């Protein structure tokens, strides 16, 4: 019965089977609650919508994510989703086969531990394993050496691996991610009278940025040219047919990844976060890391993110260092892909945590890391 | 013994049984009082006529409605009618079975509360329920999503429902209704020497408008073409054989629904009342509301009301929004039909307020709303 | 050559010049036709008497009013009168100067239109204007805010004006007027054997009521005290010296204005007609209207009409509202006075409809209303 | 000639001179248009009333605000007002001296830009400056550190300032404001049969809430005690002397500020809006912000708003944090007061935008922000 | 006018006068820059805060150290501090008297040279001298023989002195110091959801470790006992009242000094660094060094650092060697104390480098070392 791979991340959940080349089910990790009145209850109707069903009824629901900044903040809702994923969407009964879950590095221990508990107690998972998202992304590329820049709506992080050996001590992690980009866009659009405020509207704004936003190659020049009407300006058609003129914001929003101060984020831009994480490692390694900068995660789907990353990291490094950014198609699936690969590996099977094994050992087992 | 459905609205009362496809008894909610002399009393004769009996003797009675603008202004008379409805007209003894009553949203609480009191104290109703007229209208259509424009002689109102979930916060209500249309017609006909002034005459005028009036598709053009004698002009034959030439008024009266200022009504025309009520709701919903504009209530029987509504709402909305007005046959029965349907529902039975239940709880129970 | 002001109302015609403080000619709008035999024709003699000449020969003429309920019912006769007014009585040739005519609001359009036609075609009027009687009455008072209760033998009506701005939408009009009072008096006097039946006799009865009738302050008490012989009873001396004892009728006739049902008039008494017309207007206005109740028109010459009006309107209104009825001397001339004033205004001259202007434009021009 | 300070906000305009301790002229930013008929035009009379003159004639005008939600929606009308303010009401000729204008943060750029344009092109303003309302409010208090909760009928917003340094990144803004409170009150009063619907009536309702409404300290308990007749109930005397019994609504209306869902406002109550805005800022700052919660703006004149705010914010914060709400007298003038102070500052003079300076630079200059 | 002693180290600057028993001024060598917005400039306000003033305004500043790992990385900022130290904080004018500066051994020559330059060119220092921190520490103890383990937030180093004669050839130096401990603590606290990321927050974390951290005597046993809730766990109260539960980390952070690999530091723990530095020296000396292990510097304020150091160094050495660690009170002032002593010595005066002397000789003079 093989095994199930579930990219239970923030934003979207991507699930499919070990051995598949792509997730079979992709949908938002969103729980929607009937906003007006109470619910109905007596006439059924529903007091809870999940993912794409929440999207169908979006406008009458208060939308909540259970995961924020890579952390399961609302366990009740997350549990509800998990059920709705493989149990309802994939037509899978827990006990049929074991499953792979993921998380971003440097989470609170409790995040992983409680997640595990649920898999074994709420569900009948017959063996489970948790892996670092960035690591999986590298597996998807097939490389054994490089920097993984994994950036979603939850978190942005850098993992450094060299010839199969990870370097724990230099892993970087930022709260700065897609939701901050989204929130910033909601804010910045008030400059032109386009006030989005509800959770439902927030999702529209996300739709906008995923279609129109791009990374300024040279922000200064883009701002200069933005003083003149041009191809910069786009007309976004809303759900109710009214249209929005997007100007400078089309690139100013992505800009925040390189100038975090825009949103109050007292930090370094991702080009420096990356640079510095490389600087933290031995000089004997750095040369290779430079030429294997694997970029993945949905925020890296912005057009030009690779081009400008290349530009700025090149500027920071010595001119004699050759830098190469890897940015394949399907970056949005990279982690999941890695998972499919991982689970299909013969050797890997020894890493499974059997429910019984867990029951015998207890919580702490989920942090073991041999490979 | 099933249950009784009673559309106890202003204007007309339409009663029949739960499970019927149409009301069995339809008649005016009018109380007539012998105008000349006193009454008779000693020789019987009668000091009160109701509905169709008042119509028979119309010309010697002062006619009063007990309900005005959806509010039971004269309880004595309304009580008298209720008796005369099911007790006399339908041949029903209260206690045989429970009954469904209706009202327009945003009434004074006392309207519902006192009505309830009477059902349980004056009559022996063994369980009673009150429903919003617009909601019922939507049930009659069978849709779960849309705008209900319910307009009678009492009030005009807009209710927005989405996929089974009502949106309380955006319900609109106007005093502007059929009696204002009627009163205006009485007034406007003095332009041609046709002065109607009594309550009895008022009813004639109502008869006129229900036969000849129509909604101008393009009011301006109709006024222009009205400068020439044509098919516009009609000869109405009065009760005593004298005839009336109706001109421009044939459409100028319905015009007031779109230009309320004609009667001093500082408001927005119903095309804007509708438009705005949609604007009040989330952009994620508006698209669907546009395509499910359910129009019902007797004033919507004017020929062309749908055509022009379509025209003007289309003009207000974006050209990319598809708008569809639903305007079935039997719009005049829609609310009652919905009631028959509602009462026939198995689930619905839990909503009944048992007389005992009321007696135990008290007044406030009539505003509970779970479903 | 200034201009001519003509209060061409029902009952009496009052004409004088713009700038005069009172009409120069006042006489009945009555056409009398030799009742017995034919006429004479061959020996001249006359087949038509008008106004005061008809009064001279009253007893051998059938008297007809051309205007009834404010409407020119008999154009032939009205035309004849108009000639006899300014042409014969005032010694004026049409073309010397323009003229102001009046009418009660809510007349049939044709009333005004045909009147206009005659002024320009039968006569040589070099510019003409028609004004609402009530409006003019307010001008005579000099106020810019108030209720005008204008009541003659033709009609009774209420006009509401606020700070120079009329409120069309709340104008009230009743058929109930002086001729109904007169007719009722003719009828009620048969109780004591004083049967008046001819048109000539009708005029006597009018003379009676204009001398003896008064408004009961408290009708109930007056009826009670009327059971005892007192100052109530008066001896009216007829044209032939016989005398009439008037009792209760002396106030019971005016009573009908407050209890219209007495004459079959299914309506509200004038105290409620007034009250309600105020209720029809915005709460922000009503307070002022209460304190500016301008009463005018000949029927308001009954002693006590103001006192009782005050009483009953006060009762209807809230005790905190201050009510003041204006009832100057010369109420019988108020409309005409207003006309004199109006015509003397510099600004007003732009309102004249030049004969040529009319000829060019046509009928419809008489309903323009800019000021 | 000093300078002019003009709190050109929504609702009311408060103008006075730099150095004054209070505005000299305070009046509604309302434009009224003769509702019935047309206007008059030819006889003058007026086709436009502003502020207190519109209040005088309130009942015959359609009242419009030009500013809605802090945005000048109707420039024609706003221009008209500006003229009527200092030009007519204060007896000031533009060019005599420079002026200070204000606006709520996060407005559309065009709001400020167009406003500027008018000051320099329509008027002869010799130097102008625009400031954030909340900032000015803090200046009025004299503090350099704190939270400014500025809430009017337009918008509600939170600004955080620390030791003279603003924190742009954590400014909050809500549409939820006084007009929503007012509109809600209009609606909620239909429960007791007090239907207010016109723009004129809306102003009455505002008058009601400004006199009777208060903030429930414990809403639940107030609702419980509201089941019994008590001091809760008040008799409001309307403009026409009729009285209104206000019950639960007297506090249920203010309740919406803490439970926005009441009006469909999918948001957080102002106690959480405030709390969260503090949470958005560094832990090293939060302690001070807690003890300097400066509340201002006219909606904060509701009795008990401070008491309950204190209660709920205290509950949300840790028990060890000391919280202090500043709520001086003259909260309604706070912004203007700050303006007077600001303009009187020597240093501040460098911030003026000279008309010439603007003409040379152009639009963008109005968003400069050095201090 | 005596002389000034300035422990211009990383972390804190401790200044006082030659002859004093303790520094008069102690404050952080931190420069803070207004993080949000720009600054203010025009209204003054300040664009730079130093030490305790930066602490006052901590939360709105980006905090930077100018010294890192014992090296003045940012000269601009360090210069600024020096001014703010004696010039502003101590109320001293440079030229009043000569001054003693310090540094950690094995710095880049330029560190000392540039520092000197500034003292003579930026300031008017009339003679200056630079001494090795460890040497001074030994002077403070009063011993002439021993190992000085001087460990601050900048660097950790070992100096060996025997009977007044230093042994240059065996001086050890590590980057591993207090900031690594601090940074590690920031990281390790994410295990329990306590994410500190800003420079301001970093300072809080430092405050935490300086209050709660201690050195595990037996790390293994502490980890074992840490599996059970006990006295290990502490509740730290943050600046905003929220509390933090510190567990294992309370000793795991100090552990890194003995197992540097925890932070990627491929080195030997300080117990072996010390041991080995002794091994590097002649067997005829080692015996004495063992009995005079002078520990100083702020990181040695962790409770138990002496106890465990004793334990582990004893284990490494032969059982017959007597080992004694000196760990007086005021270890945090040791270097400065030594400086006060040094400057007060008569003989020592010959070591001063006169400004003129420097000007004549040039840069190289600062590395002379006779005594
Ligand atoms: C409508 C929408 C996007 C499309 C806007 C429309 C199609 O285009 C415009 O009309 C531009 C037009 C505009 C153009 C030019 C100009 O100088 C001043 C204003 N924007 C406004 O007026 C603002 C008015 C407004 C109210 N608070 C605000 C807060 C900030 C900014 C604006 C507003 N405005 C459209 C909205 O607020 C509305 C209502 C706000 C939602 C919650 N209440 N917005 C929305 O509901 C969502 C769907 C976003
Ligand atoms: N076309 C796109 N352009 C930019 N960002 C995108 C695009 N599609 C998705 N994203 C962003 O990627 C994130 C969602 O996908 P993903 O990053 O895979 O989520 P997660 O990594 O949390 O599973 C969001 O930030 C989303 O907006
Ligand atoms: N043929 C018609 N054309 C227009 N209006 C009609 C017609 N028949 C009935 N009406 C109007 O509908 C109202 C009466 O029916 P209805 O609206 O159902 O009353 P209610 O809704 O109050 O029960 C009146 O306004 C009536 O004039
Ligand atoms: N003394 C009076 N008392 C009561 N009514 C009078 C008196 N004089 C005239 N009227 C009434 O006024 C009307 C005639 O004058 P008027 O009202 O001015 O006529 P009109 O208004 O039609 O020009 C008649 O109803 C007449 O009886
Ligand atoms: N006594 C009061 N109680 C409550 N609210 C008030 C009171 N007086 C004024 N307000 C409200 O304050 C707003 C008007 O004053 P203000 O808030 O200063 O307007 P703005 O801030 O837009 O200038 C309105 O919401 C008004 O109802
Ligand atoms: N109570 C304490 N416990 C542990 N370390 C401390 C304590 N107080 C200060 N320190 C550490 O000492 C260093 C600061 O003082 P110090 O070591 O004298 O600085 P420096 O030596 O650079 O002048 C920092 O590492 C600081 O955290
Ligand atoms: Mg991801
Ligand atoms: Mg109906
Ligand atoms: Mg008259
Ligand atoms: Mg304000
Ligand atoms: Mg040190």
PDB file of C-alpha atoms and ligand atoms in Angstrom, chain D residues 7 9-12 14 150-154 178 206 209-211 297-299 301-302 332, ligand 5:
ATOM      1  CA  UNK D   7      -9.676  71.122  11.149  1.00  0.00           C
ATOM      2  CA  UNK D   9     -12.458  66.855   8.960  1.00  0.00           C
ATOM      3  CA  UNK D  10     -15.555  64.848   8.238  1.00  0.00           C
ATOM      4  CA  UNK D  11     -18.629  65.710  10.274  1.00  0.00           C
ATOM      5  CA  UNK D  12     -17.633  69.158  11.536  1.00  0.00           C
ATOM      6  CA  UNK D  14     -13.410  73.590  13.246  1.00  0.00           C
ATOM      7  CA  UNK D 150      -8.622  59.258  17.322  1.00  0.00           C
ATOM      8  CA  UNK D 151     -12.185  58.470  16.478  1.00  0.00           C
ATOM      9  CA  UNK D 152     -14.680  60.712  14.694  1.00  0.00           C
ATOM     10  CA  UNK D 153     -17.658  60.099  12.439  1.00  0.00           C
ATOM     11  CA  UNK D 154     -15.362  59.444   9.494  1.00  0.00           C
ATOM     12  CA  UNK D 178     -19.585  57.636  14.243  1.00  0.00           C
ATOM     13  CA  UNK D 206     -27.186  61.938  15.674  1.00  0.00           C
ATOM     14  CA  UNK D 209     -27.033  59.646  20.440  1.00  0.00           C
ATOM     15  CA  UNK D 210     -24.897  62.621  21.366  1.00  0.00           C
ATOM     16  CA  UNK D 211     -27.183  63.299  24.310  1.00  0.00           C
ATOM     17  CA  UNK D 297     -12.024  62.543  18.858  1.00  0.00           C
ATOM     18  CA  UNK D 298     -15.733  63.172  19.263  1.00  0.00           C
ATOM     19  CA  UNK D 299     -16.888  59.564  19.514  1.00  0.00           C
ATOM     20  CA  UNK D 301     -17.250  61.698  24.298  1.00  0.00           C
ATOM     21  CA  UNK D 302     -19.549  58.777  25.105  1.00  0.00           C
ATOM     22  CA  UNK D 332     -13.470  67.081  20.518  1.00  0.00           C
TER      23      UNK D 332
HETATM   24  N1  LIG F   5     -21.681  64.148  23.001  1.00  0.00           N
HETATM   25  C1  LIG F   5     -21.212  63.304  22.082  1.00  0.00           C
HETATM   26  N2  LIG F   5     -21.228  62.017  22.312  1.00  0.00           N
HETATM   27  C2  LIG F   5     -20.795  61.168  21.427  1.00  0.00           C
HETATM   28  N3  LIG F   5     -20.336  61.469  20.260  1.00  0.00           N
HETATM   29  C3  LIG F   5     -20.268  62.709  19.921  1.00  0.00           C
HETATM   30  C4  LIG F   5     -20.693  63.738  20.820  1.00  0.00           C
HETATM   31  N4  LIG F   5     -20.494  64.883  20.217  1.00  0.00           N
HETATM   32  C5  LIG F   5     -19.993  64.577  19.015  1.00  0.00           C
HETATM   33  N5  LIG F   5     -19.873  63.276  18.867  1.00  0.00           N
HETATM   34  C6  LIG F   5     -19.398  62.566  17.714  1.00  0.00           C
HETATM   35  O1  LIG F   5     -18.165  63.043  17.248  1.00  0.00           O
HETATM   36  C7  LIG F   5     -18.213  63.162  15.863  1.00  0.00           C
HETATM   37  C8  LIG F   5     -18.262  64.603  15.487  1.00  0.00           C
HETATM   38  O2  LIG F   5     -17.236  65.297  16.133  1.00  0.00           O
HETATM   39  P1  LIG F   5     -15.822  64.890  15.667  1.00  0.00           P
HETATM   40  O3  LIG F   5     -15.643  63.491  16.073  1.00  0.00           O
HETATM   41  O4  LIG F   5     -14.832  65.861  16.136  1.00  0.00           O
HETATM   42  O5  LIG F   5     -15.872  64.957  14.188  1.00  0.00           O
HETATM   43  P2  LIG F   5     -14.604  64.890  13.415  1.00  0.00           P
HETATM   44  O6  LIG F   5     -13.613  64.145  14.314  1.00  0.00           O
HETATM   45  O7  LIG F   5     -14.933  64.178  12.173  1.00  0.00           O
HETATM   46  O8  LIG F   5     -14.127  66.291  13.281  1.00  0.00           O
HETATM   47  C9  LIG F   5     -19.499  62.518  15.542  1.00  0.00           C
HETATM   48  O9  LIG F   5     -19.330  61.128  15.530  1.00  0.00           O
HETATM   49  C10 LIG F   5     -20.311  62.957  16.654  1.00  0.00           C
HETATM   50  O10 LIG F   5     -21.534  62.273  16.780  1.00  0.00           O
END
